[PDB]
Design a protein around this nucleic acid. Sequence first.
RNA 1: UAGCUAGUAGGUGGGGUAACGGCUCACCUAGGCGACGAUCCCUAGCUGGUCUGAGAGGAUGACCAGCCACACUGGAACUGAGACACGGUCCAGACUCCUACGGGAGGCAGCAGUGGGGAAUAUUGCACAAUGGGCGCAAGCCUGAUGCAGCCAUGCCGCGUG
RNA 2: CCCGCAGAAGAAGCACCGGCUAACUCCGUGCCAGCAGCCGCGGUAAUACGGAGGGUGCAAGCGUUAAUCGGAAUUACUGGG
Lengths: 123, 205, 71, 102, 102, 82
Amino acid sequence: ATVNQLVRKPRARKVAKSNVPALEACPQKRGVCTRVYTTTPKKPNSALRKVCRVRLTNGFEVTSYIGGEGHNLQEHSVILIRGGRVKDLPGVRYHTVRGALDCSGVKDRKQARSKYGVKRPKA
Amino acid sequence: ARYLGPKLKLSRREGTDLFLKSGVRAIDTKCKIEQAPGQHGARKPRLSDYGVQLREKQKVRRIYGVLERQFRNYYKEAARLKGNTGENLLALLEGRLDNVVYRMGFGATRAEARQLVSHKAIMVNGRVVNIASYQVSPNDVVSIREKAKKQSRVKAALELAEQREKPTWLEVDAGKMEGTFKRKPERSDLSADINEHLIVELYSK
Amino acid sequence: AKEKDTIRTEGVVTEALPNATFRVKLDSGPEILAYISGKMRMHYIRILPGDRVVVEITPYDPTRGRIVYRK
Amino acid sequence: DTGAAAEPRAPVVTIMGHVDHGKTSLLDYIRSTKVASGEAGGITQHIGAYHVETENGMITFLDTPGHAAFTSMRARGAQATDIVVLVVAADDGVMPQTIEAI
Amino acid sequence: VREGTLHKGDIVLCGFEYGRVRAMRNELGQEVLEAGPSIPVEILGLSGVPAAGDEVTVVRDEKKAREVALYRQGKFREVKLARQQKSKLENMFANMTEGEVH
Amino acid sequence: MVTIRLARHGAKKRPFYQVVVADSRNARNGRFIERVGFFNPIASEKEEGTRLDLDRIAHWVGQGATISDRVAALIKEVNKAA
RNA sequence: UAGCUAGUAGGUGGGGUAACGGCUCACCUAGGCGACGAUCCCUAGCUGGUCUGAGAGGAUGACCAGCCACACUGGAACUGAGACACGGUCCAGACUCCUACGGGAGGCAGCAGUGGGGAAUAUUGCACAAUGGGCGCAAGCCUGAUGCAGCCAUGCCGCGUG
RNA sequence: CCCGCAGAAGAAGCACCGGCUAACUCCGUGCCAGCAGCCGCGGUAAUACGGAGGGUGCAAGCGUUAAUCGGAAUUACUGGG
């Protein structure tokens, strides 16, 4: 571009929007939820994967992946909700935190207990 | 703090001895050098360009027995000083108190040297000094104090100390359990094992 | 590791939707949305309504079947 | 404690039966309060504990509704108290409430 | 209060709730600092509203007591929240029960 | 009005005072006209530790500034000679 | 968001203020501002700085320090060197409490602390011993400023678990 | 802050190991269960899932997530078309 033009109208940075409407400089939010489905992914993969409609405390209805092997979650249940997209499913940008609030940890899991909410085995 | 684990595994992983055990004898039988530890170490490594940098960082760090955060602090000080950064790095590491005790030969090993400075045996210019990381100055006398004097710990060490090739930057003394640190190490004085541009290169990315 | 709490039971295929998705009426259960299994796609097999298939159902979501067994 | 050197305890006493007929009145009379029937509907609807001076001697009193929903409170009040009193009126002579306190 | 002593600095553990006593009230008497062997005392500055059906006990240390309370509360939630969900299993998954589900 | 006084910037349980010319209304750590010395009471065996430019302090006394009781004591300690 | 401004723009005289002044009035003239972005809307306490970056730059203004603004909501003045006054005052409004129900009292965006919000941030602590203020000739009194402790792996750094 | 006493006694966990990217095999499950930052793995011999053994990184912390800048010469004045 020409230097007189840049004096006249300057350069302008991109908006750089976030991936999560949960936002608000928050890592964690809360919600009361409603419905737990098991929906198919996109055709390159196959499975039935556990997904929940979380009504957030700030009034936003969003959808969220349930990790780990099974869960206790149903109906009205208060869970913790962190970020992170799952690309194989449609539009899920969030994950529920296992072993928090109303959520069970994954029983009989032994490795990687930083995820899945499992206190260390003692014998 | 401290590594605490099995000493020989680090030498066997790095593929050149780190002198961690090495008291009574420099024994081949225990070491099993260049065979690698664990089940699948028999195979040829075919190491990457990132890995040869990362290996050399661990090789230097495991000699002096430092952890990455403390080791990073020496790199930051060595960088701001004029002249070569790798040399100013190795100068600060060699300038450690637990290191000078190993160089004078009061202790058998670097871990026993760190034990003696922690256990308040060692005094520098008549101060007692707990801290292993302590930076020794030019013109610093160093000595063992009366409680730790003439025990089985120091006495066995002073015997096996004679075998060593003997540093060029300090006066050994040690007829009465003391030593004197005369002047700075320089690149010629210290060992040829380290690749000095290489360890500095890894922190650049 | 996997646990064997999934249930397999039969049903008549009522109607074929898009995407290899089928409306199958079970014998005891209601009519459920069933996707075809991987194996049929793998061996290039297509199916048709009015036929009686074994349909794996999960306790978590009882509205989603899985057409396991052949025509 | 060292050697079990424990010293006397004044009795905690509970009262069950019907409000206004006498269950409030026994407590209210010692404290001289006139607080009987001061709650809505003229009835006691929750548990409370009150310590008294009997001139001379000390006693503590616990008070609870005699009624159906307050069964768990009367179960805890009986085992917490040293002595239980059951007030009874000659209008009915026997109640569904009286056998619960027995 | 069963046992006749108490001070402001005491750490208290009530069920799965814990805390230090901020202030003490004995009925209308708000000037109490100690407990008799049969008196009722209001506790204040305890965390949360406890379940009120059970025994309250003072403990040695605030750092430790807190930890204990936390752990026990966690345990309580744990068993009560686990088992249940899965169990509702078959019915929830297997069959739509009846109709008069209103 | 102007006062010569000791302000504390040093670490917890090791006071290091900065003797300073400031108005009385301003807080101890706050707004000031100029620095004039330092006072280390904790000190060390080294010679330095109490320092005050006397041409500055006599100037401010000449403009009418009053002296805090510690600084008044430290002036009559260091004098021309201690 | 392209036209916006009547005390608006300028002058004279009167009044006003510690003091300049459309500051405020009477009268006279018709200007003022405007694409080098006026006016309007949205959003925002600012800076020495912090963080990142080879630098240029970008993002940001917690802590520390300078300055301004606000003190239940809305408006005004008094006293005074200085306020249109955080724990002064008067009135109206909202709201809480008290009451003999006629009428009154209260303002933690001070330190602790509680309800509630929220993913989540502390002890209803000790002392004027020290610095620094207020008053007093001074002793001395007052000072939740400040100095200190308690609590939390929150961060940085040191050391150990041989 | 210093001295004394006793005795290895009281004190190591966490993530990751298909490529990117330092660090591998077996067993269970069988396009299911589930993993996934990105490209992607799993439909009967899974170095990518679950478990175990071995290994690597870092340390009283470790990891994930959110937030900002960097890499980005990807608003480019320095420094683009």
